[PDB]
Design a protein around this motif. Structure first.
Motif, PDB file in Angstrom:
ATOM      1  N   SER A   1       0.156   8.708 -10.702  1.00 51.22           N
ATOM      2  CA  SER A   1      -0.193   7.391 -10.399  1.00 51.22           C
ATOM      3  C   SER A   1       0.667   6.895  -9.112  1.00 51.22           C
ATOM      4  O   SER A   1       2.199   8.178  -8.473  1.00 51.22           O
ATOM      5  N   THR A   2       0.745   6.086  -8.146  1.00 52.36           N
ATOM      6  CA  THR A   2       0.656   6.399  -6.388  1.00 52.36           C
ATOM      7  C   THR A   2       2.188   5.350  -7.177  1.00 52.36           C
ATOM      8  O   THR A   2       2.038   4.118  -8.204  1.00 52.36           O
ATOM      9  N   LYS A   3       3.289   5.724  -6.969  1.00 55.06           N
ATOM     10  CA  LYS A   3       4.643   5.091  -6.418  1.00 55.06           C
ATOM     11  C   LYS A   3       5.653   4.739  -5.340  1.00 55.06           C
ATOM     12  O   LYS A   3       5.379   6.026  -4.710  1.00 55.06           O
TER      13      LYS A   3
ATOM     14  N   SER B   1      12.104   3.994  -2.635  1.00 53.71           N
ATOM     15  CA  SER B   1      13.048   3.325  -2.799  1.00 53.71           C
ATOM     16  C   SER B   1      13.854   3.608  -1.533  1.00 53.71           C
ATOM     17  O   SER B   1      14.116   4.952  -1.346  1.00 53.71           O
TER      18      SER B   1
ATOM     19  N   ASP C   1      12.409   8.240  -4.898  1.00 48.51           N
ATOM     20  CA  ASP C   1      10.995   8.517  -6.434  1.00 48.51           C
ATOM     21  C   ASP C   1      10.212   7.669  -5.908  1.00 48.51           C
ATOM     22  O   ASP C   1       9.812   6.645  -5.655  1.00 48.51           O
ATOM     23  N   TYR C   2       9.117   8.126  -5.162  1.00 51.66           N
ATOM     24  CA  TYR C   2       8.093   8.911  -4.923  1.00 51.66           C
ATOM     25  C   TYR C   2       6.653   9.663  -5.098  1.00 51.66           C
ATOM     26  O   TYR C   2       7.037  10.180  -5.395  1.00 51.66           O
TER      27      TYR C   2
ATOM     28  N   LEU D   1       8.783  12.983  -9.107  1.00 53.17           N
ATOM     29  CA  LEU D   1       8.704  12.343  -7.473  1.00 53.17           C
ATOM     30  C   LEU D   1       8.923  12.601  -6.699  1.00 53.17           C
ATOM     31  O   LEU D   1       9.757  13.865  -7.273  1.00 53.17           O
TER      32      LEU D   1
ATOM     33  N   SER E   1       1.159   3.552  -1.336  1.00 51.39           N
ATOM     34  CA  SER E   1       1.549   2.631  -1.851  1.00 51.39           C
ATOM     35  C   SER E   1       1.872   1.563  -0.907  1.00 51.39           C
ATOM     36  O   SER E   1       2.041   0.691  -1.295  1.00 51.39           O
TER      37      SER E   1
ATOM     38  N   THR F   1       3.317   0.616   1.404  1.00 52.61           N
ATOM     39  CA  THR F   1       5.072   0.466   1.631  1.00 52.61           C
ATOM     40  C   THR F   1       5.456   0.861   2.535  1.00 52.61           C
ATOM     41  O   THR F   1       5.136   1.636   3.398  1.00 52.61           O
TER      42      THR F   1
END
Lengths: 14, 220, 221
Positions: free
Chosen positions: C123-125, C128, C152-153, C183, C211, C213
Motif C-alpha cells: 500500500s501507498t505510504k 518521513s 519509509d515510503y 519500504l 501519497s 505528501t
C-alpha cells in the motif's frame, strides 16, 4: 511499404 | 514487428570527442517512393520524457545543436555526437514509424569518462540522527562520500570501534555530467534504544584516491 | 505552448485496472492522434497505442489489444488509457505523446510528463523527512554538507528540490534503497559554503505524489 496509420501524425509527403 | 537493435548498449566517450550509436532495423525502412527513412532519434534524460532529435533519419529537429548528426539509410543508421558535452550524456533511442506497432531500440546509454586518467578521492561527511527522528524511536546515521571517481568505494560502519554488519544500506548516484564523479550515501539504521547504548559512531571509507582509509566519526 | 498534462502517479493491485488521463491544450484537439507509450524502469519504450483526438479511431499494439482501451473526450480535450488485468510487467511510466508530428507545414514531438504506475499489493505510504544538519563533522575545505533523509515510503519515486528549485548546484539526490520492510528510503544532500550557514536558508522540498505528501524541511546548523 510504410503504413500511414502506424502514426497518423506523420504526413509522408516530401 | 520491426525489431530495432542498437549497438553498443552503453558508450563511454570523453568531452569534445565523437560518440557513435548504431541502430539496425530488422526490415528496410526506406520507402523508395519518397526516398525517406522512417526513423527518428530520441534523447532521454532520467526522469524526463524523451526528446526528438532527428526524424527522417537525418532531418534535424529545430534546436538540436549541429554537433548532432544522423547518418544511414535502409536498415543501418548512426547517431553521431561529433563533440560531446555534459548536456548530451543521456540514453539514445532509435525509433521506427514505418509500420505498426511503433517500436524503439533497446537504447544506448551515453556515459562520460574522465579524459584526465586521474582519480578523485571522496570528501567524507557524517550526520548523526536528527532529533526529530530520535523522537520516533529510530536512529539513522548517514555517511556521505562526495564527488569521487572511480565509482568503486568501500564504506564500513563501526559502532564503539566494532565493525558492523547487517544494519547499513548503500546507494551510489549515477555519474555527474559536469565532473563525471559519483557520490555515495550509506545509512546505518539502529533502534533508538540500540543507538543510545553506544557513543562512538564512525564510517571508514576505502577508495583508490585515498592513500589510506579515512574514518569520519562522532560521539553521541 | 502545446501541452500534454497527465494524471498523477498510482499504485494498483495485480489484476486490477488503471486509467491514466492526458489533458491536451495548445492545439486543435481534433487534428492529431495521441499515442500512449510505456517504459518499465530501465527498459526500452514500449508503444501502447494511439487515438485520434477528433475522429476517435484507435489503434492498439497487439501486445495490449486484449487489456487496453484508449478513449477521448473532445470537449475536455482529454485522452484516456485504461489498462486492465494488471500484471507485474505493467509497473512502468505511462506517457501520452504527440509522437513525431510531421505535418506538411511543421514537425514537432511533445510528450506528457508521464505517469508512474506501480503494480503491487503493498500500500501507498508517504515518507518521513528528517534534517541532515550541517555540523563540524560535515565540513571539509571550507564547505559544509547538509541534506534531508526521506525515509519509509512506497512506492517510488519521491522528488527532492532545494529552496524550491533555486538551489541545484552541488545537489545529489541518491537512488532509493529498498529496506527489508519493503519500504524505500533515500537521502538528498548539498554542499554549500560553511561561512554562510548563518545567513543562508536551506529548505528541502520533498514530494511523494502517490501519497500526496509535501514536506518542506528547514535544514539549519
Amino acid at each position: 511499404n510504410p503504413d500511414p496509420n502506424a502514426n497518423p501524425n506523420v504526413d509522408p509527403n516530401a | 514487428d520491426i525489431v530495432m537493435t542498437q549497438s553498443p548498449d552503453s558508450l563511454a566517450v570523453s568531452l569534445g570527442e565523437r560518440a557513435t550509436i548504431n541502430c539496425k532495423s530488422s526490415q528496410n525502412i526506406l520507402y523508395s517512393s519518397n526516398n525517406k527513412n522512417y526513423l527518428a532519434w530520441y534523447q532521454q534524460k532520467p526522469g524526463q520524457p524523451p526528446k526528438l532529435l532527428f526524424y527522417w533519419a537525418s532531418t534535424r529537429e529545430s534546436g538540436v545543436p549541429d554537433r548532432f548528426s544522423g547518418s544511414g539509410s535502409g536498415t543501418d543508421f548512426t547517431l553521431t555526437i561529433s563533440s560531446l558535452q555534459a548536456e548530451d550524456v543521456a540514453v539514445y533511442y532509435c525509433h521506427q514509424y514505418y509500420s505498426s506497432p511503433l517500436t524503439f531500440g533497446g537504447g544506448t546509454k551515453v556515459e562520460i569518462k574522465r579524459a584526465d586518467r586521474t582519480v578523485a578521492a571522496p570528501s567524507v561527511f557524517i550526520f548523526p540522527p536528527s532529533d526529530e527522528q530520535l523522537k520516533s524511536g529510530t536512529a539513522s546515521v548517514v555517511c556521505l562520500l562526495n564527488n569521487f571517481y572511480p565509482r568503486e568505494a568501500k564504506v564500513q560502519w563501526k559502532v564503539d570501534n566494532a565493525l558492523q554488519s547487517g544494519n547499513s544500506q548503500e546507494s551510489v548516484t549515477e555519474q555527474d555530467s559536469k565532473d563525471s564523479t559519483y557520490s555515495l550515501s550509506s545509512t546505518l539504521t539502529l533502534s533508538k534504544a540500540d543507538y543510545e547504548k553506544h557513543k562512538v559512531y564512525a564510517c571508514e571509507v576505502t577508495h583508490q584516491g585515498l592513500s589510506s582509509p579515512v574514518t569520519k566519526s562522532f560521539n553521541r | 505552448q502545446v501541452h500534454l498534462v497527465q494524471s498523477g502517479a498510482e499504485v494498483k493491485k495485480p489484476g486490477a485496472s488503471v486509467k491514466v488521463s492526458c489533458k491536451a491544450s495548445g492545439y486543435t484537439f481534433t487534428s492529431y492522434a495521441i499515442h500512449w507509450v510505456r517504459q518499465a524502469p530501465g527498459q526500452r519504450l514500449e508503444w501502447m497505442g494511439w487515438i485520434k483526438g477528433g475522429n476517435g479511431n484507435t489503434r492498439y499494439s497487439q501486445k495490449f489489444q486484449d487489456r487496453v482501451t484508449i478513449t477521448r473526450d473532445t470537449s475536455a480535450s482529454t485522452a484516456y488509457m485504461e489498462l486492465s488485468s494488471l500484471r507485474s510487467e505493467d509497473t512502468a511510466v505511462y506517457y501520452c505523446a504527440l509522437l513525431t508530428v510531421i505535418t506538411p507545414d511543421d514537425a514537432f514531438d511533445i510528450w506528457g510528463q508521464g505517469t508512474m504506475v506501480t503494480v503491487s499489493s503493498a500500500s501507498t505510504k508517504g515518507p518521513s523527512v528528517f534534517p541532515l544538519a550541517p555540523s563540524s563533522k560535515s565540513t571539509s575545505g571550507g564547505t559544509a554538507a547538509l541534506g534531508c533523509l526521506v525515509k519509509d515510503y512506497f512506492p517510488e519515486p519521491v522528488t527532492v528540490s532545494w529552496n524550491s528549485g533555486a538551489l541545484t548546484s552541488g545537489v545529489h539526490t541518491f537512488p532509493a534503497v529498498l529496506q527489508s520492510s519493503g519500504l524505500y528510503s533515500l537521502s538528498s544532500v548539498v554542499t554549500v559554503p560553511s561561512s554562510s550557514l548563518g545567513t543562508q536558508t536551506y529548505i528541502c522540498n520533498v514530494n511523494h505524489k502517490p501519497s500526496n505528501t509535501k514536506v518542506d524541511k528547514k535544514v539549519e546548523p
